[PDB]
Short mmCIF file of C-alpha atoms in Angstrom, two decimals:
data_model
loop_
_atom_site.label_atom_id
_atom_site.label_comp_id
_atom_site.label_asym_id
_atom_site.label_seq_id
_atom_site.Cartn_x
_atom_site.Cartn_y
_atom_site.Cartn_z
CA UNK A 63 84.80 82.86 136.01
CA UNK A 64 81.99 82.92 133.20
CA UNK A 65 82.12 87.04 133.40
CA UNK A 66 85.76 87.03 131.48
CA UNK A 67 84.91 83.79 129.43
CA UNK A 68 81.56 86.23 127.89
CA UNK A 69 84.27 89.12 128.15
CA UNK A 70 86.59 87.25 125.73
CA UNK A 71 83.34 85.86 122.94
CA UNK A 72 82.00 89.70 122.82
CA UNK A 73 85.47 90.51 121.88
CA UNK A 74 86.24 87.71 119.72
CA UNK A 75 83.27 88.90 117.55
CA UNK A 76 84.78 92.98 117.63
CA UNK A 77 87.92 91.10 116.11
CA UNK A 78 86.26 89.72 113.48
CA UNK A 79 84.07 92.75 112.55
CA UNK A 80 87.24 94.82 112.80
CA UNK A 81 88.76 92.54 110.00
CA UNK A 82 86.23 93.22 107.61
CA UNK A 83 85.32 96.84 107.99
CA UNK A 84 89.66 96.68 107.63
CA UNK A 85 89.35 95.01 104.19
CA UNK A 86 86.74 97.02 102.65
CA UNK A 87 88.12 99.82 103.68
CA UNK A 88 91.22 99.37 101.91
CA UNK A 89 90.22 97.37 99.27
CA UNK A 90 87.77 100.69 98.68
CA UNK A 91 90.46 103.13 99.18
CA UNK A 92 92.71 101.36 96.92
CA UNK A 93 90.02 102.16 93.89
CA UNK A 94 90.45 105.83 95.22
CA UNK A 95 94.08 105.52 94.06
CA UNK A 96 93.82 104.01 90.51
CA UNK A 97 90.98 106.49 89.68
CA UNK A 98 92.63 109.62 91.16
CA UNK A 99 96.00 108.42 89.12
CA UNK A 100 94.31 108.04 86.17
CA UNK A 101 92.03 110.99 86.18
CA UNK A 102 94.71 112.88 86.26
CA UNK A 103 96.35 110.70 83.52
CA UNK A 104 93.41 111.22 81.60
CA UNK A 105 93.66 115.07 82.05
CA UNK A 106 96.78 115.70 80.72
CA UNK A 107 95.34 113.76 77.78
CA UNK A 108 92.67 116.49 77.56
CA UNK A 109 95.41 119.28 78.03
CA UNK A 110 97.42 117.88 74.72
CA UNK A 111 94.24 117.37 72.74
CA UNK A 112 93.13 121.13 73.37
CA UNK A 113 96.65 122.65 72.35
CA UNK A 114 96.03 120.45 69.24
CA UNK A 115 92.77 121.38 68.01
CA UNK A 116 93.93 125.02 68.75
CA UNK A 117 96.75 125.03 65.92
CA UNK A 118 94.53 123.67 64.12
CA UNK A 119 92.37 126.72 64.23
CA UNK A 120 94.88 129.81 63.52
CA UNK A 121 96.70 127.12 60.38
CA UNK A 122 93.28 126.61 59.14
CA UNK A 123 91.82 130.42 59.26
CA UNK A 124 95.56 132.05 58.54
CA UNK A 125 95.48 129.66 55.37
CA UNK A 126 91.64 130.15 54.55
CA UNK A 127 91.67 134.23 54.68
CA UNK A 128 94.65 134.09 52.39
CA UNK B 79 104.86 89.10 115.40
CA UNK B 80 101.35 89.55 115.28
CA UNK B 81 97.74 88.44 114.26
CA UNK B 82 96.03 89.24 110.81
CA UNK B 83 92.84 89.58 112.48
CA UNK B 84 92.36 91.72 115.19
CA UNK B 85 95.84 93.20 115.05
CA UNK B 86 97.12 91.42 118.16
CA UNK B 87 100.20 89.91 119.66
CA UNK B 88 99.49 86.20 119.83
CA UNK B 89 99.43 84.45 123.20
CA UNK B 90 99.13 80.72 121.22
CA UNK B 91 99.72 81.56 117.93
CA UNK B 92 98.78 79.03 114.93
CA UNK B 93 99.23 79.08 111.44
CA UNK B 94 97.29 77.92 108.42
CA UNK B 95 98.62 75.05 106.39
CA UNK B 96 96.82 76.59 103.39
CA UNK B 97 98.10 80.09 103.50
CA UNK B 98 100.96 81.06 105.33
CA UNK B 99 99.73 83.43 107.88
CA UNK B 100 99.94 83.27 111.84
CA UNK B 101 96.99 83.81 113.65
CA UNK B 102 95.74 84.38 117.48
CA UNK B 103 94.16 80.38 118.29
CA UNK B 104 90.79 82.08 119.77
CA UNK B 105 90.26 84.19 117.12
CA UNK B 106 90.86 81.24 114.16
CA UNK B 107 88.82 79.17 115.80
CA UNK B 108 85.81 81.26 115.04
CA UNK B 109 86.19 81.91 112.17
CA UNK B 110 86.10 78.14 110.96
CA UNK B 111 82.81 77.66 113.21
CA UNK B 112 81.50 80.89 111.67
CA UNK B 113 82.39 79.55 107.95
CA UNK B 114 84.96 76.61 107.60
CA UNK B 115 87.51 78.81 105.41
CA UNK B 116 90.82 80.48 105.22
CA UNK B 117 89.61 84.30 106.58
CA UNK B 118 92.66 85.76 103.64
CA UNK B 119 92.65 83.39 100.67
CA UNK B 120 89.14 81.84 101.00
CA UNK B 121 90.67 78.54 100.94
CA UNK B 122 89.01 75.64 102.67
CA UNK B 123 90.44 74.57 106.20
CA UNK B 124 88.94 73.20 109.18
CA UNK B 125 90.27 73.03 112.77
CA UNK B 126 92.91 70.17 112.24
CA UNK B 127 94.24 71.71 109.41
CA UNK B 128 96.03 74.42 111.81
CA UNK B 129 98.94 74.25 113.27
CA UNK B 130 92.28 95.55 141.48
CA UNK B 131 91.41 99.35 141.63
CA UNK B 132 92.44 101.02 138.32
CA UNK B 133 92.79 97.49 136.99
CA UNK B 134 88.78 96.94 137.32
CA UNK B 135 87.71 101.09 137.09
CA UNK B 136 90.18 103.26 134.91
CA UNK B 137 92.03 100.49 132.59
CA UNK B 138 89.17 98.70 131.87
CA UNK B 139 87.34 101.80 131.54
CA UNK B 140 89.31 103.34 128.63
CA UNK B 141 89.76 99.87 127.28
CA UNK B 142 85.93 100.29 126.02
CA UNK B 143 86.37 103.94 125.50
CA UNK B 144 89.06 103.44 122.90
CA UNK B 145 87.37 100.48 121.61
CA UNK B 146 83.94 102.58 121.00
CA UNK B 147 84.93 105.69 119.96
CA UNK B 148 87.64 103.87 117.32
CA UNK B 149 85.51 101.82 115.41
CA UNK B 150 82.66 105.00 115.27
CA UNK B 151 85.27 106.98 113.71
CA UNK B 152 85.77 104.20 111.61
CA UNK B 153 82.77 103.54 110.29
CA UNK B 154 82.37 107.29 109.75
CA UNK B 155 86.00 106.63 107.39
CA UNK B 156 83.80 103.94 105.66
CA UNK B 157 81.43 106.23 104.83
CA UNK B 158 83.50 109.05 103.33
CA UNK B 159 84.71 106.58 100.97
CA UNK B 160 81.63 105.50 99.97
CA UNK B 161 80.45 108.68 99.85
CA UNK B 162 82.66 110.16 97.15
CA UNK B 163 84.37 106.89 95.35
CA UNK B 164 81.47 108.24 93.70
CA UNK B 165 82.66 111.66 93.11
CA UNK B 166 86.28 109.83 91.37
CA UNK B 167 84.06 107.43 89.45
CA UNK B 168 82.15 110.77 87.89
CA UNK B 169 84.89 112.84 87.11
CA UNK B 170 86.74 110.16 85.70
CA UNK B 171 83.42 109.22 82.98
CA UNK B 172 83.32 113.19 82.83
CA UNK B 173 86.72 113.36 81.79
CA UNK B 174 86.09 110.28 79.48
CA UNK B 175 83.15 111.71 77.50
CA UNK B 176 86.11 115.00 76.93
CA UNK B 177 88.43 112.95 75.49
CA UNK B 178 86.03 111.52 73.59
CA UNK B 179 84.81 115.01 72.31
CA UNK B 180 88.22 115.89 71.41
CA UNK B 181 89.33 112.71 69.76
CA UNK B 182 86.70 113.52 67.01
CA UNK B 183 87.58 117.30 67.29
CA UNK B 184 90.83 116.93 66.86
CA UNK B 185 91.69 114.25 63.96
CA UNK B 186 89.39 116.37 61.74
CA UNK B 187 90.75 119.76 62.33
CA UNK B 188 94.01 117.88 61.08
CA UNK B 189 92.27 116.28 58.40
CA UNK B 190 91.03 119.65 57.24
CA UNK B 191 95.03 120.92 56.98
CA UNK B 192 95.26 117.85 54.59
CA UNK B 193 92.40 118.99 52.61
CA UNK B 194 93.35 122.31 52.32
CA UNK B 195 96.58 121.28 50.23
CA UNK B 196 93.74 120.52 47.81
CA UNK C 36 106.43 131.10 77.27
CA UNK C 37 105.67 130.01 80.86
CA UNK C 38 103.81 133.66 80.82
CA UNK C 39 101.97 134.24 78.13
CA UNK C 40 100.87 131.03 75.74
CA UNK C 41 99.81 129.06 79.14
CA UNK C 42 97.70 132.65 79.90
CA UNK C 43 96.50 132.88 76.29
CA UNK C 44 95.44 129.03 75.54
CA UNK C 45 93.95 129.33 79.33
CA UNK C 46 91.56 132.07 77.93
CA UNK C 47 90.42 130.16 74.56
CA UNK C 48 89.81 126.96 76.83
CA UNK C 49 87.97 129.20 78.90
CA UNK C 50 85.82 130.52 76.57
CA UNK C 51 84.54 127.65 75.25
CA UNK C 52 83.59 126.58 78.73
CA UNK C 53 81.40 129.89 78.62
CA UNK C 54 79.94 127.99 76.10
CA UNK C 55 79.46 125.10 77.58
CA UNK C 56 78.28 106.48 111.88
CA UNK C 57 75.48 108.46 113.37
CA UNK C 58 77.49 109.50 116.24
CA UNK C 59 80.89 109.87 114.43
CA UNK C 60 79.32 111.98 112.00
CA UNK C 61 77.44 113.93 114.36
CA UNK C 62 80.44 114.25 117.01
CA UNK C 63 82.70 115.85 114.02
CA UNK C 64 80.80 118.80 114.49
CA UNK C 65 83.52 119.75 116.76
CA UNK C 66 82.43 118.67 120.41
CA UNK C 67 84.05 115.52 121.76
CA UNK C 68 81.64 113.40 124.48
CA UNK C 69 82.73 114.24 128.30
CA UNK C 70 84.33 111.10 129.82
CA UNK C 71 84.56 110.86 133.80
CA UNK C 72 86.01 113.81 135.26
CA UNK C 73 85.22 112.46 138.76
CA UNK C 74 88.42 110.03 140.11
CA UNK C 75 90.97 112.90 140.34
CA UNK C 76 88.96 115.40 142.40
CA UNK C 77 86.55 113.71 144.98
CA UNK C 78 87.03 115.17 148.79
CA UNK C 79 87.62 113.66 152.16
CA UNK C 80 84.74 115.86 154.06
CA UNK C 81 82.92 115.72 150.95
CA UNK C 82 80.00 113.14 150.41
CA UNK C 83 80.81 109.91 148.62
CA UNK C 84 82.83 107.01 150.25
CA UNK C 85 82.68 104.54 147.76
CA UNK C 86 85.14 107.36 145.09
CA UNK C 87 87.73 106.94 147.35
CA UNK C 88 87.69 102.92 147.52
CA UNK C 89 85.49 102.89 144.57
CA UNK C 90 87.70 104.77 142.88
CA UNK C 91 91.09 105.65 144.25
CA UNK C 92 92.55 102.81 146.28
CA UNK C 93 92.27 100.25 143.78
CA UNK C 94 93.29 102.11 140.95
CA UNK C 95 96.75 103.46 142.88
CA UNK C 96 97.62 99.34 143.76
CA UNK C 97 97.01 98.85 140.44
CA UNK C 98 99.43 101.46 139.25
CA UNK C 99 101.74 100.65 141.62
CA UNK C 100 101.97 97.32 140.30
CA UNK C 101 101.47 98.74 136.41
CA UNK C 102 104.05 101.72 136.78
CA UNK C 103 106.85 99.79 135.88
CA UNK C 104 110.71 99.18 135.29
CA UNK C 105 111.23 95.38 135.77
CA UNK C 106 111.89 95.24 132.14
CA UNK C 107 112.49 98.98 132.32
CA UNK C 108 114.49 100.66 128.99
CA UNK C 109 115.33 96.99 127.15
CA UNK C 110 111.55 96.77 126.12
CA UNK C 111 111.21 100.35 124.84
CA UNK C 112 114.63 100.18 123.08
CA UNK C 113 113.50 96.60 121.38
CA UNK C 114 110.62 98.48 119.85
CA UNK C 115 112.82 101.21 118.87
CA UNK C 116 114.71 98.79 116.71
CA UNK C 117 111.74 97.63 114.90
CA UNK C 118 110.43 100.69 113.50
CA UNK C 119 114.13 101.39 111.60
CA UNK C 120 113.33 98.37 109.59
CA UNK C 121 109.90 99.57 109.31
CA UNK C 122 111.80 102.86 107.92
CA UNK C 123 114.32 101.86 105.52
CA UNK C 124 111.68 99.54 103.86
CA UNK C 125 109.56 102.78 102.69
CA UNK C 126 112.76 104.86 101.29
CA UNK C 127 113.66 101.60 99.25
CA UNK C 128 110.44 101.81 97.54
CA UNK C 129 111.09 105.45 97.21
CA UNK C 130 113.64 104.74 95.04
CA UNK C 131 112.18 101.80 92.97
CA UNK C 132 109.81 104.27 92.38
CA UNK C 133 112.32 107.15 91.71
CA UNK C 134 113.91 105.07 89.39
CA UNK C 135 110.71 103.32 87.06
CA UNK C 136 109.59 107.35 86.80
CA UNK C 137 113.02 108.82 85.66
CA UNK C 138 112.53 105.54 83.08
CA UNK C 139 109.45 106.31 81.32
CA UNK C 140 110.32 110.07 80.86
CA UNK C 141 113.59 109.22 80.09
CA UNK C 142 111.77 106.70 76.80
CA UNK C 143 109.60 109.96 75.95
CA UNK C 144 112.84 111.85 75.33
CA UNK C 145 114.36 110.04 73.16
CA UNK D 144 114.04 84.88 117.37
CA UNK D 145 116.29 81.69 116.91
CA UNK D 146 116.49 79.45 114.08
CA UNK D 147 116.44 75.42 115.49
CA UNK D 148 118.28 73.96 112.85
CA UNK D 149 122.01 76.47 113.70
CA UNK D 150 120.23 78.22 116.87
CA UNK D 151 121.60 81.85 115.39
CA UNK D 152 118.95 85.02 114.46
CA UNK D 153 118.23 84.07 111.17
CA UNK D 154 118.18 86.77 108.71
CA UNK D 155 115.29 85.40 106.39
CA UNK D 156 112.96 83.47 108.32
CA UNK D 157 110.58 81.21 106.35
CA UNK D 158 107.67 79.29 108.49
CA UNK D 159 107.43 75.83 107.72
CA UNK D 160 103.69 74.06 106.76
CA UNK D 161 104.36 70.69 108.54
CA UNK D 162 106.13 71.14 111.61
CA UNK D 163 104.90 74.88 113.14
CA UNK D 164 108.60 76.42 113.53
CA UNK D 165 110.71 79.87 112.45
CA UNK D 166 113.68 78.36 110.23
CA UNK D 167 116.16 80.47 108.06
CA UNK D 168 115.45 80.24 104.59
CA UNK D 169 118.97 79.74 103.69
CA UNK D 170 119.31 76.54 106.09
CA UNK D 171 116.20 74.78 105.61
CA UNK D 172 116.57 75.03 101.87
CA UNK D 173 119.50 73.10 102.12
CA UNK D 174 117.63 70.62 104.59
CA UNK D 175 115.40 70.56 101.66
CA UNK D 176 117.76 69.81 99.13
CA UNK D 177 119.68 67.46 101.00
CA UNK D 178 115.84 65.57 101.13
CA UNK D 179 112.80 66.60 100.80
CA UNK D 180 111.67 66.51 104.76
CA UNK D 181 111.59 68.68 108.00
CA UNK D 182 113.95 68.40 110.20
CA UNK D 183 112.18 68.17 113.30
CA UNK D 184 109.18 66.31 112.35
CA UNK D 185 110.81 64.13 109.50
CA UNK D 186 107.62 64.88 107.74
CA UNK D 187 107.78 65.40 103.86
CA UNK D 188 108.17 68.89 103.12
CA UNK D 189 109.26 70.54 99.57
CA UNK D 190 110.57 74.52 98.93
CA UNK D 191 107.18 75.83 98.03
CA UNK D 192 105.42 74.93 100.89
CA UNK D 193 107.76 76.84 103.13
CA UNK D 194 106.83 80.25 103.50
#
C-alpha cells in the first residue's frame, strides 16, 4: 500500500519541477520575442539612416565640384 | 478543466481564494508545505484558505519512459535558450551602437547641405 | 527601382563594411536509446518462462480490459469539440492583429 | 458543465471565491446585484471576487 503512496510523493515533486522549468522557459522565450521584434525594428532604422547619409554624399560632392 | 501545475485533469480539484485558479488537491498541498504561497501570484495562502500484466510491465513502463526522456529534452530546450538569448541580446547592442554611429553621421551630413547655402 | 538602386546602395553599404541536458544533448546526435524489444517476440520452445507470464499474460488482460468502447465514439467526439474553440480563438487574434497592423501603416500614409 | 443557479450550460462561467461552484456570469451577477451574497452558501460575495 506504501509502494503507490511513495509512487504518488516522487511524482508530486516531478509536478512541481515541471512547473518551474515551464515558467522559465517561457518567461525566457518570451524575451526571445521582444528582442527578435525589435532587432528587426531597429534594423530598418539602420536601413533609413544609410539611404540618408548616402544623399547626403552625391548633394554634397555634386554641389562641392561645381 | 485542468491543473496549472502539472498539466493534469483534477480528480479533487480546489481553488485558491487569492487567485482564481483550480488546482489538483495533492499537488497544492505541497506547495504550501514547501513555501506557504500562491505557486502563480506569490500571494500568501495557507491550507484553509483553499477551497495486471501490461498494467504493471508495458503501461507503467512507458509511463517513465515518456516521463524521462520528456523532461531531458526539456531541459536540453532550456538550454538553447539560454544559450543564445545571448546571441539576441548582442545583436540587438550591435545594432544599437549602428544607430548610434549613424545618428551622428547622418544629422551632420544634413547640416553640411545647410552650410553649403553659405 | 526594385533592380537597380536596392543593387547599387547594397554595394556602397557594402563597401564600407570592407572597411569595417547531458543526455539530451548528447542523444541529438541522431541515435535514439533502444527501449525493450523483447515482449513481442519471445518463443514457446525457447528459454524463458517468466516473458510469457512475465510478460505476455498480464499485459493481454490488461488490454483486454484497456482496449475499449464502453464510452466508445462520445469521448473522442467530446474532445473533438474542444479543440474548435481552441481554433477559432487563434484566427480572432489573427485579425485583431490584422487589423492594429493595417492601422499603423495606414497613420504613416497619411 | 451546469450552472446551479438555472441548471443550463452556461456560456460564461465565472468561479465563485466563497462557495467552490461553476456559475454563469450573467446569472450570478444579477444574484449579486440583487445582494451582495452567494447563493448557495449565503456568504457575502461582491462582482470582483468572482472570477
Amino acid at each position: 500500500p506504501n509502494l503507490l503512496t511513495s509512487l504518488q510523493n516522487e511524482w508530486d515533486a516531478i509536478m512541481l519541477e515541471n512547473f518551474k522549468l515551464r515558467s522559465t522557459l517561457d518567461s525566457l522565450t518570451k524575451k526571445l520575442s521582444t528582442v527578435m521584434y525589435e532587432r528587426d525594428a531597429a534594423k530598418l532604422v539602420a536601413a533609413q539612416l544609410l539611404m540618408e547619409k548616402n544623399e547626403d554624399s552625391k548633394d554634397l560632392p555634386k554641389s562641392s565640384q561645381q | 478543466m485542468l491543473c496549472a501545475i502539472s498539466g493534469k485533469v483534477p480528480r479533487r480539484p480546489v481553488l485558491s481564494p487569492k487567485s482564481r485558479t483550480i488546482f489538483e488537491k495533492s499537488l497544492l498541498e505541497q506547495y504550501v508545505k514547501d513555501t506557504g504561497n500562491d505557486p502563480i501570484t506569490n500571494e500568501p495562502l495557507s491550507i484553509e484558505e483553499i477551497v495486471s500484466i501490461p498494467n504493471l510491465l508495458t503501461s507503467l513502463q512507458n509511463e517513465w519512459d515518456a516521463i524521462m526522456l520528456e523532461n531531458f529534452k526539456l531541459r536540453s530546450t532550456l538550454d538553447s535558450l539560454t544559450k543564445k538569448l545571448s546571441t539576441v541580446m548582442y545583436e540587438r547592442d550591435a545594432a544599437k551602437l549602428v544607430a548610434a554611429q549613424l545618428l551622428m553621421e547622418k544629422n551632420e551630413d544634413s547640416k553640411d547641405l545647410p552650410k553649403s547655402s553659405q | 527601382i526594385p533592380d537597380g538602386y536596392k543593387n547599387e546602395i547594397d554595394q556602397l553599404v557594402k563597401k564600407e563594411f570592407a572597411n569595417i541536458t547531458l543526455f539530451l544533448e548528447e542523444y541529438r546526435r541522431k541515435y535514439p536509446r533502444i527501449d525493450t524489444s523483447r515482449y513481442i517476440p519471445n518463443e514457446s520452445s525457447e528459454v524463458s518462462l517468466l516473458g510469457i507470464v512475465d510478460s505476455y499474460l498480464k499485459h493481454q488482460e490488461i488490454v483486454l480490459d484497456t482496449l475499449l468502447p464502453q464510452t466508445v465514439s462520445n469521448q473522442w467526439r467530446i474532445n473533438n469539440d474542444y479543440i474548435r474553440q481552441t481554433c477559432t480563438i487563434v484566427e480572432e487574434m489573427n485579425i485583431q492583429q490584422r487589423k492594429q497592423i493595417n492601422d499603423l501603416e495606414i497613420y504613416r500614409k497619411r
